[PDB]
Design a binder for this molecule. Structure first.
Ligand SMILES: *[C@@H]1O[C@H](CO)[C@@H](O)[C@H](O)[C@H]1NC(C)=O
Ligand SMILES: *[C@@H]1O[C@H](CO)[C@@H](O)[C@H](O)[C@H]1NC(C)=O
Ligand SMILES: *[C@@H]1O[C@H](CO)[C@@H](O)[C@H](O)[C@H]1NC(C)=O
Ligand SMILES: [Ca+2]
Ligand SMILES: [Ca+2]
Ligand SMILES: [Ca+2]
Ligand SMILES: [Ca+2]
Ligand SMILES: [Ca+2]
Length: 539
């Protein structure tokens, strides 16, 4: 920096180029030689994907942590991801290198320290003494992994320009991103710089940016968000989405046609208001007619087959889980023409031709930051139907809550509802008890404390999942594996009688050991994502 005076003083790399960002000549004054160097303007410019405090740069510049997929690295991790001894760069046993210390003399390729000369999208790596293993990535702790970007990075100032899926964020700049995506406008506190990831429209799922492909395409860039759980956080219903791309159905969701419109109460909906009382433990039962009218089935074309549950949020749009449509482990890649939704069925098999409508989908949006390789993180999917579905007493959409509203609910409700034809037991276990159920069952379950559900699992719970089910005991027993894969978990509000979907059934560890819970994907986060995916329309 150059705050007026201070140029009487001799250059300081730390004060000036490390404590503050900088320019070429400030650098020079400080430097003794005009080595505008290579991997040293890169000691700077590969370190730009870092920009937080005195340290994140010093840590980066003194090559101790990896920058993004960091060809900045110059540490001493002589080992692999598994833990194989690293082969010396200078060697040819067991593997004769293609990339010696001349091909890539920019990079610090000496001894046997993990480096990233060629830039692996897996980053810093090394040659392996395990002669069957040529190269392999190395487990380096990354820069200020201990930092925690907060508030989904509303504040975020730094400069990432590619997404999780590694695409280049187009600059907000453009004649379409600005002057043809002007249609939607933002929070003007958030400085949009070129094409660096930002969170203008206050999205709950993190930062993002427009991308190439279809107009309004986009994705969420990778950043290490703080653990901000809603569970640790109106008089009636005001509408959220634009009803030209959502379809109508919104301003009138969650009020059931054959109940909340008839001032009639359903057989276990009392249990839900009276959420505090140490209830007896009510099991599943054949639901009433038109009790969950946002219910959706997801039918595979040939052969006939019931894949998953899903839910209806409007005339057009149908919500389910990502893993339902796409799962490389079961070699699963379904597409818009393989799939049919049966909206508002009651039997598992019969064709309720007076009643249910069946539909083709006009495009299937798998969720942007969905990933299974680790652990079904962000297991979410959105589908638009080839024509608005006409409502009635059997079909009628649900309400998707903001955070503030889901926040409200969990404060007051301590139970929710899970319905389906028990497809989760069907997909994910051998289902060796009594067979699949004959009708759309219904049950109510308790929500568990975030900590309980956290230390109730070897697995890990992001601030984006949640758990349900009574905690197994000798009469306080536990069947957890309830509901449909990719289905709804709803709660009813005692402020507007409306039914919100709180979660999306995912895979439960509580499908194996008697002692676990059903895991659910919080739907409060989703709005703005949905907000962008709809807006990519007009008709
Ligand atoms: C890597 O080499 C250094 C050389 O001092 C040594 O301290 C370290 O123990 C070595 N580790 C392995 C796995 O070879
Ligand atoms: C470095 O490896 C290349 C790759 O084939 C090899 O041909 C060459 O002999 C090596 N470079 C030098 C300068 O010896
Ligand atoms: C699944 O198949 C489609 C159509 O053949 C293909 O374009 C695509 O590569 C696959 N999609 C994914 C997400 O793997
Ligand atoms: Ca200064
Ligand atoms: Ca200065
Ligand atoms: Ca200076
Ligand atoms: Ca200063
Ligand atoms: Ca100067």
């Amino acid at each position: 920096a150059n705050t007026f005076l201070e140029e009487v003083r001799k250059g300081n790399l730390e004060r000036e180029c490390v404590e503050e960002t900088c320019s070429y000549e400030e650098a020079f004054e400080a430097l003794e030689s005009s080595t505008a160097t290579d991997v040293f303007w890169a000691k700077y410019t590969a370190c730009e994907t870092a920009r937080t405090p005195r340290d994140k740069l010093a840590a980066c510049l003194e090559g101790n942590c990896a920058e993004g997929l960091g060809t900045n690295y110059r540490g001493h991790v002589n080992i692999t991801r598994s833990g194989i001894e690293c082969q010396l760069w200078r060697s040819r046993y067991p593997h004769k290198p293609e990339i010696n210390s001349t091909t890539h003399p920019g990079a610090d390729l000496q001894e046997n320290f993990c480096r990233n000369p060629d830039s692996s999208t897996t980053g810093p790596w090394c040659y392996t003494t395990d002669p069957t293993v040529r190269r392999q990535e190395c487990s380096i702790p990354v820069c200020g992994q201990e930092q925690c970007v907060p508030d989904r990075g509303q504040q975020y100032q730094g400069r990432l320009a590619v997404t999780t899926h590694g695409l280049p964020c187009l600059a907000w700049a453009s004649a379409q991103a600005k002057a043809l995506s002007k249609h939607q406008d933002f929070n003007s506190a958030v400085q949009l710089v070129e094409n660096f990831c930002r969170n203008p429209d206050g999205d709950e799922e993190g930062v993002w940016c427009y991308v190439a492909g279809k107009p309004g395409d986009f994705g969420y860039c990778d950043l290490n968000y703080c653990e901000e759980a809603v569970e640790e956080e109106t008089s009636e219903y005001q509408t959220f989405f634009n009803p030209r791309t959502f379809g109508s159905g919104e301003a009138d969701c969650g009020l059931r046609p054959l109940f909340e419109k008839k001032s009639l109460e359903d057989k276990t909906e009392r249990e839900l208001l009276e959420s505090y009382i140490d209830g007896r433990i009510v099991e599943g039962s054949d639901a009433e007619i038109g009790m969950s009218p946002w219910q959706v089935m997801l039918f595979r074309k040939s052969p006939q087959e019931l894949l998953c549950g899903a839910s209806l949020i409007s005339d057009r749009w149908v919500l389910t889980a990502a893993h339902c449509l796409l799962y490389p482990p079961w070699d699963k890649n379904f597409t818009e023409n393989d799939l049919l939704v049966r909206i508002g069925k009651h039997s598992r098999t019969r064709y309720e031709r007076n009643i249910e409508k069946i539909s083709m989908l006009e495009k299937i949006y798998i969720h942007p930051r969905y990933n299974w390789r680790e652990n079904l993180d962000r297991d979410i999917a959105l589908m638009k139907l080839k024509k608005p579905v006409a409502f009635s007493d059997y079909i009628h959409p649900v309400c998707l809550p903001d955070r503030e509203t889901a926040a409200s609910l969990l404060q007051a409700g301590y139970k929710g509802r899970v319905t389906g034809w028990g497809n989760l037991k069907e997909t994910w276990t051998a289902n060796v008890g009594k067979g699949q159920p004959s009708v759309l069952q219904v049950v109510n379950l308790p929500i568990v404390e975030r900590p309980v559900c956290k230390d109730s699992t070897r697995i890990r719970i992001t601030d984006n999942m949640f758990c349900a089910g009574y905690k197994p005991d000798e009469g306080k027993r536990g069947d957890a594996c309830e509901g449909d894969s990719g289905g709804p978990f709803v709660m009813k509000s005692p402020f507007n009688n409306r039914w919100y979907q709180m979660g999306i059934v995912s895979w439960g560890e509580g499908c194996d050991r008697d002692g676990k819970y059903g895991f659910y994907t919080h739907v409060f986060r989703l709005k703005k994502w949905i907000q962008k995916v709809i807006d990519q329309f007009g008709e």
